Amino acid sequence: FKKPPINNPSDDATIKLAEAAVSVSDSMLEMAKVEKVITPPSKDNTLTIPNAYNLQARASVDWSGPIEELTARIAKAAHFRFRVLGKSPSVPVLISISTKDESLAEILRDIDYQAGKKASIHVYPNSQVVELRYA
Amino acid sequence: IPPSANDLLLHVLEGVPPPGSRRLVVSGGDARAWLSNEKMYVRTNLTILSPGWLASMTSADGTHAYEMQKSPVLLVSWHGKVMQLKVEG
Amino acid sequence: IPPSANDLLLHVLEGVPPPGSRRLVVSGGDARAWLSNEKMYVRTNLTILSPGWLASMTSADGTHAYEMQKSPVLLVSWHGKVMQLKVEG
Amino acid sequence: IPPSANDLLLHVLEGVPPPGSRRLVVSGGDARAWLSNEKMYVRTNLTILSPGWLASMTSADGTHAYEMQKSPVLLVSWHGKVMQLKVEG
Amino acid sequence: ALKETALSVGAQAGLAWRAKIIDEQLNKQARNLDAIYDFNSLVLEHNILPPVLLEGRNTLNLADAQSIRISDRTYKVAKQAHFITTPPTWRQYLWMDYVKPEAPKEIWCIYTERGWKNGIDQANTILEENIARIKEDFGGMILYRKLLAMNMVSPPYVSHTDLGVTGDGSEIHIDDRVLRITALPELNVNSAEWRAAVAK
Amino acid sequence: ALKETALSVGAQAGLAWRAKIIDEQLNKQARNLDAIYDFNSLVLEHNILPPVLLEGRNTLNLADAQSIRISDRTYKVAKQAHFITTPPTWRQYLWMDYVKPEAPKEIWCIYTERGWKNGIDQANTILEENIARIKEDFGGMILYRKLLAMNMVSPPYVSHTDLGVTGDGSEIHIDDRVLRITALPELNVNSAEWRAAVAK
Amino acid sequence: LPCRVDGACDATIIKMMTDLNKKGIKVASVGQNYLISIPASALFADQSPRLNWASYSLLNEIAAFLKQFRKIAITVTSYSSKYVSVKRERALTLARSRVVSEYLWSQGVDSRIIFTQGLGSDKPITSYTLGGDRSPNARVEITFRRAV
Amino acid sequence: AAAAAAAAAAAAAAAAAAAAAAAAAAAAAAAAAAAAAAAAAAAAAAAAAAAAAAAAAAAAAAAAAAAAAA
């Protein structure tokens, strides 16, 4: 033998309150469906994983501050050259990473992402150089 | 120009009370609360949901410190559970 | 130039009383009445017929909100039936 | 320009108390302490560790003389052992 | 007179008992009321609590014997949009207050029952206004999202003045963004760019 | 009332007893706490006690309805670096005070047990703040040594004005070195020379 | 006042734990990871995603045992022996676990998530492969971690 | 309390009591995760009772009148 559910709407008011709950929560959902701006993954603009074996090493950083210094440091942690293209503004591009254990190509993913449109990262893995481009 | 935060949130991001405070006992959750001057400050790692806070910081280990007005009940999320915390003072 | 309506009819078009009111109990019909300052306001969906009102609004669902002077009886139409409602205060 | 030391540390580098003092009895270690004017002076050959001193001298035989504020307990190292000394006054 | 103070004994006990019963009757439907009064996913893009718009259709005012004014719809901005940190729950709006009253013949018994139902339905009217206030506030935010779609209001225009490292040497703040609301959400009267709710 | 002063008798006795138990419970772990709170090998090159830096990440202030300020990290210099003679132990920060209280039916017994646990957990909150204060002060010095590596603060710049034999003929001091701190440790805002904690 | 017990007692926890081990539902108790392992003979019919009517009593002290702990995510995962194919098998065990978690959140858990999944004998606890649901490999397992 | 597993061994802070088999269901400190969901206070979930008043009504610190407790 089985039981009915414990918080079950087994009551003529609470069924109306809970069918209203079902109707308001899915009406919130087609809400969130119509105003959810997305990016398609064909056109996401962010970096990929540049799949070089030096970039798949095993790192850790705690930081807030200006972006060119970390990517200088993760270039020379990845044994990569670091190029900068563009001009640094007087307000610096200020990002912050505090992960104690993740992959350092995915640092450069987090770098590009928290840069956004003030700057961006390119990786050339055959040339073994990362490059930081401003606008 | 607004003020930055309160810098005493750095102290209640540690466990130490503000100078010249009154202790508030907290029931039903891991939080500590002090009342400095008609404002309470809560060290927790829970997430306060209902009564609204004026300032917040967070340490390295996910401990948060909140400046808020004195409300005798705090509503938090613990791990997705809506939870109540009760303060005297 | 006349005033537009009272904008507090927007509040009593919802169920909420005006700020600083007195509740009036209503018998014999689905209405709520409050008295702000020598004027009562009635949230109903019935149609008040006899004592005359000074202002009216109506929501999306046919709920009406009436500003009128204090009369101890309201006469409405319910569904073509002439009906009486009785208020104390 | 700071003062050099206190020159009365020369006297309490010997065993002699400062002029116009009060004796302080010292328990649990070989030290002598006097209180001149809201400051105590300790002749010892132990090493005072916790409460911090304002001035120090040392004689030829490793006896030290310390000027410090009045703290009712002294923590020393004896021979690598952390040790407590207790003063009344 | 003793009958009157018997009624006054019964009133507050009935109020506190009815307050108790509807408090855990609220707490039995706690996740359902978070589904109903979900203010959390009604807030705007910069965690701005939306304002409460009030709709009144089909309005008359009898000003005097000589003149009336009708208007067809009235939209009012009440308690304007503002920076909320954590969104409102239903529990600030609906929770009635529980204190346990510790303050204590035949006419006493019959009027403490009529005091008891007077306390019960007076607690019911307090709860009715609490539901009324949350339905005002929440449906006003819903009425914004109608008129923000329907172009009768402005969205709020924020301004983020980014600042770099900030302060003296005793205190730094590293990424110092000051966020203001410049333009409040606000009904436009230039009415040609309005919309209309036609669906299928 | 007699029940209340029974509780007040039980409170201070429970506080002093709990103070006693955690004092030799501290003294049982005395060398372990010298290992934990080793301030001695945290001091700087000229026996300078390092300052206490406070980190607060991910900060919001709701200033009013119109404006918030977020900052990502906040570093505060609290109780700035200074010449220490002998380094702090844990015993100034953690030792609760033992006095032996010599000041003395059924309701008395049950409320002296509830006074006794009130004294016990109130002594526990005093100890909790003592541990909190030593964790603030010590981890602030650790946070310096992070930021001194990580170039967000200056090291202190001492100056040793050496003097030769000094004084009149009634008093000589032979090798007379005056040591000052000129530049205090101090957070730089010129932020391009900062570092970043990348390891492997 | 704050509550001492949270609707549960430790004597009742070990009373249900002995009674479930006497009826053969094996309760492993490692750290705070709790495992109750249920043979699929003791709940369902053979090679079916359908409960027997008497087995909801077995689910009754399963759910009343799951009253007693503060828990965040129960995961319920089911796997049986090979019947036709691994694709039919994984459809069976997915329906199997989702049916028993539908009954478990019909009943009382204070869990916030029940994850529920089924596998195609991909993790079998013995190499002896006697038959269908009478195999001791053919089982559902309900594992969680007791929070604080 | 911690019944029939064994007696209560420790009392783990930031937790419940620790029986001498396993972790018990009885809360050790005030600051454990005890499932409060029904408070009992005047003007809870608005701000607290503004204590300076001496009148008939009970005013909250958010300047609401607690008409359910006056």
Short mmCIF file of N, CA, C and O in Angstrom, two decimals, chain D residues 1-85:
data_model
loop_
_atom_site.label_atom_id
_atom_site.label_comp_id
_atom_site.label_asym_id
_atom_site.label_seq_id
_atom_site.Cartn_x
_atom_site.Cartn_y
_atom_site.Cartn_z
N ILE D 1 65.24 63.93 17.88
CA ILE D 1 66.26 63.09 18.50
C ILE D 1 65.70 62.37 19.72
O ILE D 1 65.15 63.00 20.62
N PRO D 2 65.80 61.04 19.73
CA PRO D 2 65.30 60.26 20.84
C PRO D 2 66.21 60.37 22.04
O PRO D 2 67.38 60.76 21.92
N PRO D 3 65.71 60.05 23.23
CA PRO D 3 66.60 59.83 24.37
C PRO D 3 67.41 58.55 24.19
O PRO D 3 67.04 57.66 23.42
N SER D 4 68.52 58.50 24.91
CA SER D 4 69.55 57.49 24.68
C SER D 4 69.13 56.12 25.19
O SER D 4 69.07 55.15 24.44
N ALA D 5 68.92 56.04 26.49
CA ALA D 5 68.26 54.97 27.20
C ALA D 5 67.66 55.67 28.39
O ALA D 5 67.43 56.88 28.35
N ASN D 6 67.37 54.94 29.45
CA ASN D 6 67.31 55.63 30.71
C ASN D 6 68.65 55.29 31.35
O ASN D 6 69.10 54.15 31.29
N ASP D 7 69.25 56.28 32.00
CA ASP D 7 70.47 56.08 32.76
C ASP D 7 70.25 55.38 34.09
O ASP D 7 71.22 55.05 34.77
N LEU D 8 69.00 55.17 34.49
CA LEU D 8 68.70 54.46 35.71
C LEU D 8 68.72 52.96 35.47
O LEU D 8 68.76 52.16 36.42
N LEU D 9 68.76 52.56 34.20
CA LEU D 9 69.05 51.18 33.83
C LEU D 9 70.45 50.75 34.19
O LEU D 9 70.68 49.56 34.36
N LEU D 10 71.39 51.69 34.31
CA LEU D 10 72.69 51.41 34.88
C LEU D 10 72.59 51.00 36.34
O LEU D 10 73.34 50.12 36.78
N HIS D 11 71.69 51.62 37.09
CA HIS D 11 71.49 51.23 38.48
C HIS D 11 70.78 49.89 38.58
O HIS D 11 71.18 49.03 39.37
N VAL D 12 69.78 49.65 37.73
CA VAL D 12 69.10 48.36 37.86
C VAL D 12 69.77 47.29 37.01
O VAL D 12 69.29 46.16 36.94
N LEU D 13 70.89 47.63 36.37
CA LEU D 13 71.80 46.61 35.89
C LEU D 13 72.67 46.09 37.00
O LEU D 13 73.09 44.93 36.98
N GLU D 14 72.90 46.91 38.00
CA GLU D 14 73.35 46.42 39.29
C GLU D 14 72.12 45.96 40.05
O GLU D 14 70.99 46.08 39.58
N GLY D 15 72.29 45.47 41.26
CA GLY D 15 71.08 45.08 41.95
C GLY D 15 70.33 46.19 42.63
O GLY D 15 69.27 45.93 43.20
N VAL D 16 70.87 47.41 42.62
CA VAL D 16 70.37 48.49 43.47
C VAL D 16 69.08 49.04 42.88
O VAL D 16 68.95 49.11 41.64
N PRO D 17 68.06 49.29 43.69
CA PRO D 17 66.82 49.87 43.20
C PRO D 17 67.01 51.32 42.79
O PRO D 17 68.01 51.95 43.16
N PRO D 18 66.10 51.87 41.99
CA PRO D 18 66.12 53.30 41.72
C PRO D 18 65.77 54.09 42.96
O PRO D 18 65.09 53.57 43.86
N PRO D 19 66.23 55.34 43.07
CA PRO D 19 65.89 56.16 44.24
C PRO D 19 64.42 56.57 44.22
O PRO D 19 63.91 57.05 43.20
N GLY D 20 63.74 56.33 45.33
CA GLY D 20 62.33 56.58 45.45
C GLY D 20 61.51 55.58 44.67
O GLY D 20 60.86 55.94 43.68
N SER D 21 61.54 54.32 45.08
CA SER D 21 60.89 53.25 44.33
C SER D 21 59.87 52.54 45.19
O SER D 21 59.61 52.90 46.33
N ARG D 22 59.27 51.51 44.60
CA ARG D 22 58.52 50.53 45.36
C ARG D 22 58.98 49.16 44.90
O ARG D 22 59.20 48.95 43.71
N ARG D 23 59.21 48.28 45.86
CA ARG D 23 59.68 46.94 45.56
C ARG D 23 58.53 46.15 44.97
O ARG D 23 57.38 46.30 45.38
N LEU D 24 58.82 45.31 44.00
CA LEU D 24 57.84 44.35 43.54
C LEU D 24 58.39 42.96 43.75
O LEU D 24 59.51 42.66 43.35
N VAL D 25 57.61 42.11 44.40
CA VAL D 25 58.03 40.73 44.60
C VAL D 25 57.79 39.98 43.30
O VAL D 25 56.90 40.32 42.51
N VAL D 26 58.72 39.10 42.97
CA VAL D 26 58.72 38.36 41.72
C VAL D 26 58.68 36.89 42.09
O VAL D 26 59.50 36.43 42.88
N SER D 27 57.72 36.16 41.55
CA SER D 27 57.62 34.74 41.84
C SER D 27 57.98 33.95 40.60
O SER D 27 57.82 34.44 39.49
N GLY D 28 58.48 32.74 40.81
CA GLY D 28 58.68 31.81 39.73
C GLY D 28 59.84 32.09 38.80
O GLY D 28 59.83 31.60 37.67
N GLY D 29 60.84 32.84 39.24
CA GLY D 29 62.01 33.04 38.41
C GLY D 29 62.97 33.97 39.10
O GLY D 29 62.60 34.73 39.99
N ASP D 30 64.22 33.91 38.66
CA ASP D 30 65.26 34.77 39.21
C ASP D 30 65.19 36.14 38.55
O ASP D 30 65.87 36.40 37.56
N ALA D 31 64.37 37.01 39.11
CA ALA D 31 64.35 38.40 38.68
C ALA D 31 63.99 39.27 39.86
O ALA D 31 63.37 38.81 40.82
N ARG D 32 64.41 40.52 39.79
CA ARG D 32 64.04 41.52 40.77
C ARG D 32 63.38 42.66 40.03
O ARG D 32 63.82 43.03 38.94
N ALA D 33 62.32 43.21 40.59
CA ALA D 33 61.58 44.25 39.91
C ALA D 33 61.28 45.39 40.85
O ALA D 33 60.87 45.17 41.99
N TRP D 34 61.45 46.60 40.37
CA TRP D 34 61.12 47.79 41.13
C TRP D 34 60.22 48.67 40.29
O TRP D 34 60.24 48.62 39.07
N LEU D 35 59.43 49.51 40.94
CA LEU D 35 58.53 50.39 40.22
C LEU D 35 58.86 51.82 40.62
O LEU D 35 58.67 52.19 41.78
N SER D 36 59.35 52.61 39.68
CA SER D 36 59.79 53.95 40.03
C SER D 36 58.65 54.94 39.90
O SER D 36 58.21 55.52 40.89
N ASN D 37 58.16 55.12 38.68
CA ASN D 37 57.05 56.03 38.40
C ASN D 37 56.26 55.51 37.20
O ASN D 37 56.50 55.85 36.04
N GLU D 38 55.26 54.67 37.52
CA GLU D 38 54.39 53.92 36.59
C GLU D 38 55.14 53.11 35.54
O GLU D 38 54.65 52.90 34.44
N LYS D 39 56.35 52.66 35.86
CA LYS D 39 57.22 51.88 34.99
C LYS D 39 57.95 50.94 35.91
O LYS D 39 58.44 51.36 36.96
N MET D 40 58.03 49.67 35.54
CA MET D 40 58.84 48.78 36.35
C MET D 40 60.14 48.50 35.62
O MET D 40 60.27 48.66 34.41
N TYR D 41 61.12 48.13 36.43
CA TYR D 41 62.47 47.85 35.98
C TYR D 41 62.82 46.49 36.53
O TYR D 41 62.62 46.23 37.72
N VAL D 42 63.32 45.62 35.67
CA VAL D 42 63.57 44.23 36.01
C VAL D 42 65.03 43.94 35.78
O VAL D 42 65.53 44.09 34.66
N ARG D 43 65.71 43.53 36.84
CA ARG D 43 67.01 42.89 36.77
C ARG D 43 66.78 41.40 36.63
O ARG D 43 66.21 40.78 37.53
N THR D 44 67.25 40.84 35.54
CA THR D 44 67.17 39.40 35.37
C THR D 44 68.35 38.96 34.55
O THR D 44 69.17 39.77 34.14
N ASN D 45 68.47 37.66 34.36
CA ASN D 45 69.29 37.13 33.29
C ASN D 45 68.48 36.22 32.39
O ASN D 45 69.04 35.53 31.53
N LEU D 46 67.17 36.20 32.58
CA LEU D 46 66.25 35.49 31.71
C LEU D 46 65.92 36.38 30.53
O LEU D 46 66.35 37.53 30.45
N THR D 47 65.15 35.85 29.58
CA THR D 47 64.81 36.69 28.44
C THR D 47 63.32 36.95 28.39
O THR D 47 62.54 36.04 28.11
N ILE D 48 62.91 38.19 28.65
CA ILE D 48 61.49 38.53 28.67
C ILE D 48 60.96 38.60 27.24
O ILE D 48 61.54 39.28 26.38
N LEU D 49 59.87 37.88 26.99
CA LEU D 49 59.32 37.60 25.68
C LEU D 49 57.99 38.29 25.41
O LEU D 49 57.84 38.91 24.36
N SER D 50 56.98 38.11 26.26
CA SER D 50 55.67 38.60 25.81
C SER D 50 55.40 40.10 25.96
O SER D 50 55.11 40.72 24.92
N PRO D 51 55.46 40.76 27.13
CA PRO D 51 54.74 42.04 27.24
C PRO D 51 55.50 43.24 26.70
O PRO D 51 54.92 44.33 26.64
N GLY D 52 56.76 43.09 26.29
CA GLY D 52 57.44 44.14 25.58
C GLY D 52 58.03 45.19 26.48
O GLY D 52 57.38 45.68 27.40
N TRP D 53 59.27 45.56 26.23
CA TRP D 53 59.93 46.50 27.11
C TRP D 53 60.33 47.73 26.35
O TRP D 53 60.47 47.72 25.13
N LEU D 54 60.52 48.81 27.09
CA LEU D 54 60.85 50.07 26.46
C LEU D 54 62.34 50.30 26.37
O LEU D 54 62.80 50.94 25.43
N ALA D 55 63.11 49.78 27.32
CA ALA D 55 64.55 49.99 27.26
C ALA D 55 65.26 48.79 27.86
O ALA D 55 64.72 48.11 28.72
N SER D 56 66.49 48.57 27.42
CA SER D 56 67.25 47.43 27.91
C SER D 56 68.73 47.74 27.92
O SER D 56 69.26 48.40 27.02
N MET D 57 69.40 47.23 28.95
CA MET D 57 70.85 47.14 29.00
C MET D 57 71.24 45.74 29.42
O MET D 57 70.42 44.94 29.86
N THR D 58 72.53 45.46 29.31
CA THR D 58 73.07 44.16 29.68
C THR D 58 74.47 44.39 30.22
O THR D 58 75.24 45.12 29.62
N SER D 59 74.79 43.78 31.36
CA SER D 59 76.10 43.90 31.96
C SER D 59 77.12 42.98 31.31
O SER D 59 76.89 42.42 30.23
N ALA D 60 78.25 42.82 31.98
CA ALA D 60 79.33 42.00 31.45
C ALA D 60 79.00 40.52 31.52
O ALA D 60 79.40 39.74 30.65
N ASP D 61 78.23 40.12 32.53
CA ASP D 61 77.95 38.72 32.80
C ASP D 61 76.59 38.26 32.29
O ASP D 61 76.06 37.25 32.75
N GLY D 62 76.00 39.00 31.35
CA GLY D 62 74.74 38.59 30.78
C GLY D 62 73.52 38.91 31.61
O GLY D 62 72.43 38.45 31.28
N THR D 63 73.68 39.66 32.69
CA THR D 63 72.53 40.19 33.40
C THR D 63 71.93 41.30 32.56
O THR D 63 72.66 42.13 32.03
N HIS D 64 70.63 41.28 32.37
CA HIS D 64 69.94 42.35 31.67
C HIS D 64 69.11 43.18 32.63
O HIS D 64 68.69 42.71 33.69
N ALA D 65 68.84 44.41 32.22
CA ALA D 65 68.01 45.35 32.95
C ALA D 65 67.03 45.97 31.99
O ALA D 65 67.42 46.56 30.98
N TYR D 66 65.75 45.81 32.29
CA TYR D 66 64.65 46.22 31.42
C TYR D 66 63.75 47.26 32.05
O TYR D 66 63.31 47.10 33.19
N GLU D 67 63.48 48.31 31.29
CA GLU D 67 62.43 49.29 31.55
C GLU D 67 61.20 48.90 30.75
O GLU D 67 61.28 48.79 29.52
N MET D 68 60.07 48.78 31.44
CA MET D 68 58.83 48.40 30.77
C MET D 68 57.66 48.95 31.56
O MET D 68 57.82 49.42 32.69
N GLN D 69 56.48 48.92 30.96
CA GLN D 69 55.29 49.32 31.69
C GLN D 69 54.87 48.22 32.64
O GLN D 69 55.30 47.07 32.51
N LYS D 70 54.02 48.56 33.60
CA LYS D 70 53.64 47.60 34.63
C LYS D 70 52.62 46.61 34.06
O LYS D 70 51.52 46.95 33.64
N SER D 71 53.06 45.39 33.95
CA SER D 71 52.32 44.21 33.59
C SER D 71 52.46 43.18 34.69
O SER D 71 53.56 42.93 35.15
N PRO D 72 51.36 42.57 35.14
CA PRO D 72 51.43 41.72 36.33
C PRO D 72 52.03 40.36 36.08
O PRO D 72 52.32 39.64 37.05
N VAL D 73 52.26 39.99 34.83
CA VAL D 73 52.91 38.75 34.51
C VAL D 73 54.01 39.08 33.51
O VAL D 73 53.92 40.02 32.72
N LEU D 74 55.12 38.37 33.64
CA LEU D 74 56.23 38.45 32.73
C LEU D 74 56.35 37.07 32.13
O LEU D 74 56.15 36.08 32.83
N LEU D 75 56.63 36.99 30.85
CA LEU D 75 56.88 35.71 30.21
C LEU D 75 58.35 35.72 29.84
O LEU D 75 58.81 36.68 29.24
N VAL D 76 59.09 34.70 30.24
CA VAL D 76 60.49 34.68 29.85
C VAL D 76 60.76 33.37 29.14
O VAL D 76 59.96 32.44 29.15
N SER D 77 61.91 33.33 28.50
CA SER D 77 62.59 32.09 28.20
C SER D 77 63.67 31.90 29.24
O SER D 77 64.41 32.85 29.55
N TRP D 78 63.74 30.69 29.77
CA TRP D 78 64.78 30.33 30.74
C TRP D 78 65.96 29.70 30.01
O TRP D 78 67.05 30.27 29.94
N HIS D 79 65.75 28.52 29.46
CA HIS D 79 66.74 27.86 28.63
C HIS D 79 66.04 27.21 27.46
O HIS D 79 66.10 26.00 27.25
N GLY D 80 65.23 27.99 26.75
CA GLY D 80 64.36 27.47 25.74
C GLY D 80 62.98 27.12 26.24
O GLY D 80 62.05 27.02 25.44
N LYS D 81 62.82 26.95 27.55
CA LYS D 81 61.51 26.79 28.14
C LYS D 81 60.83 28.14 28.28
O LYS D 81 61.41 29.09 28.82
N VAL D 82 59.60 28.21 27.79
CA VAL D 82 58.72 29.35 28.04
C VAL D 82 58.24 29.23 29.48
O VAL D 82 57.76 28.17 29.90
N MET D 83 58.36 30.31 30.22
CA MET D 83 58.31 30.38 31.66
C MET D 83 57.50 31.60 32.05
O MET D 83 57.46 32.59 31.33
N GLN D 84 56.85 31.55 33.20
CA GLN D 84 56.06 32.67 33.66
C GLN D 84 56.56 33.17 35.00
O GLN D 84 56.93 32.39 35.88
N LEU D 85 56.55 34.48 35.14
CA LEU D 85 56.96 35.18 36.34
C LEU D 85 55.83 36.11 36.71
O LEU D 85 55.14 36.63 35.83
#
